Amino acid sequence: EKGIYQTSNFRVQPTESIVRFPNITNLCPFGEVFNATRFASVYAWNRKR
Amino acid sequence: GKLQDVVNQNAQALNTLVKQLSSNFGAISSVLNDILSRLDPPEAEVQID
């Protein structure tokens, strides 16, 4: 019959997924465990946390 | 005040319906996305219902 009829529903799909995270600064001194000037022996091994 | 009650009762009942989406209803999480991301799909169907 003549009139207006609601048939379906319209929605837009998301185009892409975007992931955010803060900056990677304030890092621990990890460069000294591999580039130290001298490594200790096995009987006096360094205990680092 | 007669016209103020029609706007107030319709808006407050709408805000109640939005507030029902944050209810746990006995489940682990009120938000839907954390249920799938933390529970296995073979037993997630109890928490969905």
Partner: protein
């Protein structure tokens, strides 16, 4: 007999809070598109637009009265981005009787349909229905004083309601 530099490492999980996760990096920033935004502690689908809000330096989240996330900061740049939901609405088909004609007009309700003749109304927009300047009597209601009909080799026209 050549000496080697051997470094061992160990991982554990105590009741203390975590320190290192990946830090797993990020992606680029996309604005004015319907995307799945992810952040430090929230996930959702929405469109990001530039805002002029007055967020406190310690404040990151933003909620309305109905406790829905409206504006969150991107964590690297000091910038404010609004979140409005991706546009949705019902689909209404405006047609005359099938004994008269089979032509239809599709009304996409509550959407700016440049994202999906095209005539923009206050109830959405009309696809396949043209707009005429003269005003006729309403037979098929749409909303906001706009009514469609089947008149003049024949096509669906849209006009303003004649009150009398």
């Amino acid at each position: 007999y050549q000496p080697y530099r051997v470094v061992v490492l160990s991982f554990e999980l105590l009741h203390a809070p975590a320190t290192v996760c990946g830090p797993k990096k990020s992606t680029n920033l996309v604005k004015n598109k319907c995307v799945n935004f992810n952040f430090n502690g929230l996930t959702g689908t929405g469109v990001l637009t530039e805002s002029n809000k007055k967020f406190l330096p310690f404040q990151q989240f933003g909620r309305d009265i109905a406790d829905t996330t409206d504006a969150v900061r991107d964590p690297q740049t000091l910038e404010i981005l609004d979140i409005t939901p991706c546009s949705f609405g019902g689909v209404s088909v405006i047609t005359p009787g099938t004994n008269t004609s089979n032509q239809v007009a599709v009304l996409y309700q509550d959407v700016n349909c440049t994202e999906v003749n095209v005539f923009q109304t206050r109830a959405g927009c009309l696809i396949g229905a043209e707009h005429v300047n003269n005003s006729y009597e309403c037979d098929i209601p749409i909303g906001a004083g706009i009514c469609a009909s089947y008149q003049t080799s024949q096509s669906i026209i849209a006009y303003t309601m004649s009150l009398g």
